[PDB]
Amino acid sequence: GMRVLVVGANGKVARYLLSELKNKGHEPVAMVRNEEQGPELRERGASDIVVANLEEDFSHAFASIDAVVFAAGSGPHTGADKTILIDLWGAIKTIQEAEKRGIKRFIMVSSVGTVDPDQGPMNMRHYLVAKRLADDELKRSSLDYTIVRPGPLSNEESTGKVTVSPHFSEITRSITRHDVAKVIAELVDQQHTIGKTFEVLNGDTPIAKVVEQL
Amino acid sequence: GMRVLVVGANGKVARYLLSELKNKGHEPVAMVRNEEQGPELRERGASDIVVANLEEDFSHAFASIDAVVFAAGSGPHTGADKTILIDLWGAIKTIQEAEKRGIKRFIMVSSVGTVDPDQGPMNMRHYLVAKRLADDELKRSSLDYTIVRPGPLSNEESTGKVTVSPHFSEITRSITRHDVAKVIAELVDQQHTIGKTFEVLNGDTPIAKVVEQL
Ligand SMILES: NC(=O)c1ccc[n+]([C@@H]2O[C@H](COP(=O)([O-])OP(=O)(O)OC[C@H]3O[C@@H](n4cnc5c(N)ncnc54)[C@H](OP(=O)(O)O)[C@@H]3O)[C@@H](O)[C@H]2O)c1
Numbered sequence: 186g187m188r189v190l191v192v193g194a195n196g197k198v199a200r201y202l203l204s205e206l207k208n209k210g211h212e213p214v215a216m217v218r219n220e221e222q223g224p225e226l227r228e229r230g231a232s233d234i235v236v237a238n239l240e241e242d243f244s245h246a247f248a249s250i251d252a253v254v255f256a257a258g259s260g261p262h263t264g265a266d267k268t269i270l271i272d273l274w275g276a277i278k279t280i281q282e283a284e285k286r287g288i289k290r291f292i293m294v295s296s297v298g299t300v301d302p303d304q305g306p307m308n309m310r311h312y313l314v315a316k317r318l319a320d321d322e323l324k325r326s327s328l329d330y331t332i333v334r335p336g337p338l339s340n341e342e343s344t345g346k347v348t349v350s351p352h353f354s355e356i357t358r359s360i361t362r363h364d365v366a367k368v369i370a371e372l373v374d375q376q377h378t379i380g381k382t383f384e385v386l387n388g389d390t391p392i393a394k395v396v397e398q399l
Numbered sequence: 400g401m402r403v404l405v406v407g408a409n410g411k412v413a414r415y416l417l418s419e420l421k422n423k424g425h426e427p428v429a430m431v432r433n434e435e436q437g438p439e440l441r442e443r444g445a446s447d448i449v450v451a452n453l454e455e456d457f458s459h460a461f462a463s464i465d466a467v468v469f470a471a472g473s474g475p476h477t478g479a480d481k482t483i484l485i486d487l488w489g490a491i492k493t494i495q496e497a498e499k500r501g502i503k504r505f506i507m508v509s510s511v512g513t514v515d516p517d518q519g520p521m522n523m524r525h526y527l528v529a530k531r532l533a534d535d536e537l538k539r540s541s542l543d544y545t546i547v548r549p550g551p552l553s554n555e556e557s558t559g560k561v562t563v564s565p566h567f568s569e570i571t572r573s574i575t576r577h578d579v580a581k582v583i584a585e586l587v588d589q590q591h592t593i594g595k596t597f598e599v600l601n602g603d604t605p606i607a608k609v610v611e612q613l
């Protein structure tokens with residue numbers, strides 16, 4: 186059972202992820218910007234709460250941690266300034282802090298669209314570049330990484346069933362946030378998933394079996 | 400005499416740079432987004448004009464080129480989306496295109512503030528990260544690079560006199576855009592400046608002598 190720091194722990198995927206990690210026998214440590222978000226994240230599955238901000242010194246957050254999941258993001262309501270500062274620069278600093286501390290296991294929540302950002306919708310291209318460049322920083326690191334690139338996210342209830350590819354030639358489906366969380370929790374302690382980058386949609390294959398074959 | 404592609408050739412520094420390169424015996428090739436900008440850049444010193452856009456396929460621009468100067472930028476009037484897409488992603492693609500083609504000589508026009516972007520003014524921090532990460536991409540490349548980090552830019556007339564440092568412990572001065580252009584033109588064909596990153600302010604030392612000692 187790993188102590189897993191969830192960076193971005195108040196987000197929609199992350200919230201589900203706290204519960205998925207708990208029920209896999211892990212100890213989810215939720216990182217939050219303000220202390221008042223903590224009580225409900227404990228109800229959702231967090232073992233511990235750490236109050237830290239990616240824009241400030243957040244090194245204290247990484248104390249006694251076995252694995253990091255980067256699930257943070259600025260979102261569609263803050264500017265492209267925050268896409269740079271959170272999704273890209275924040276991720277880069279989380280990676281450096283994990284190396285510094287010797288935390289080997291790192292799961293990146295990325296996105297489809299990142300293999301070829303210049304072919305993505307112009308209105309999204311800045312986001313896709315930010316995600317891509319963060320992925321590349323992880324790929325250049327010494328960490329035991331896995332990069333999960335979900336398709337378009339939905340808020341439907343979990344199906345428990347997905348499809349994966351190193352890279353789909355087209356994206357014609359969505360994935361529920363519940364199911365992304367399930368995928369991450371399934372692979373956090375799977376050594377055979379180290380060094381893997383994959384895209385994930387809802388589909389027909391049970392999540393446990395998909396992860397077995399990654 | 401080198402054929403020097405000036406990326407961002409319609410900008411304020413770049414415009415002066417066309418003339419500085421010409422009068423050093425180089426052939427400045429101005430890259431512009433639209434053809435109508437070309438006639439005046441020829442008057443300012445350009446030997447040739449190439450019409451290309453960093454957001455589209457611009458590989459044709461790099462034909463018959465000996466050196467690249469990246470002097471492009473989104474500016475304070477477009478969004479942080481364009482800081483990502485031009486200053487960072489555009490630079491990254493220019494670097495890749497230079498490697499692809501075997502163009503060895505690359506001069507980056509960067510900025511002070513990049514050694515420690517989190518200590519810079521919050522309103523500028525996204526820009527400083529973009530510049531920093533572009534600099535790091537160049538530093539990881541196989542190119543014969545020089546990175547010039549000017550201080551705050553001014554539109555005063557050239558003094559011809561500067562101060563340099565690997566990194567100033569404080570910035571209490573500006574530098575004219577004329578003088579930045581002079582610095583770049585001075586070092587483009589100087590082999591001893593390869594692998595050098597430095598900050599540059601106006602000061603007391605003639606530009607030729609500063610470059611001799613880099
Ligand atoms: N939308 C899509 O269709 C789509 C597609 C592919 C990939 N994705 C990616 O999937 C990820 C997870 O999705 P999601 O729906 O869970 O996103 P979300 O609900 O926006 O989660 C983002 C979290 O990041 C946190 N955060 C923001 N700034 C922070 C900072 N400075 N320090 C620490 N935390 C900070 C937020 O905190 P607060 O609670 O304080 O706001 C929020 O809880 C996204 O981040 C996105 O990049 C999305």
Ligand SMILES: NC(=O)c1ccc[n+]([C@@H]2O[C@H](COP(=O)([O-])OP(=O)(O)OC[C@H]3O[C@@H](n4cnc5c(N)ncnc54)[C@H](OP(=O)(O)O)[C@@H]3O)[C@@H](O)[C@H]2O)c1
Pocket residue numbers: 406407408409410411412413430431432451452453454470471472473474485486508509510511549550551552553576
């Ligand atoms: N302001 C400061 O105090 C300061 C301090 C330190 C460093 N700097 C850096 O110094 C650099 C040079 O300064 P400057 O004053 O010459 O800037 P500038 O006048 O804004 O020059 C930027 C140029 O980039 C071009 N450009 C924009 N998008 C492009 C694209 N997609 N493809 C090709 N070209 C594109 C613009 O073209 P158009 O002519 O079509 O607009 C413009 O000519 C800046 O880029 C900045 O990063 C500035």
Ligand SMILES: [Cl-]
Pocket residue numbers: 297298299300301302304
């Ligand atoms: Cl793609």
Ligand SMILES: [Cl-]
Pocket residue numbers: 511512513514515516518
């Ligand atoms: Cl600095």
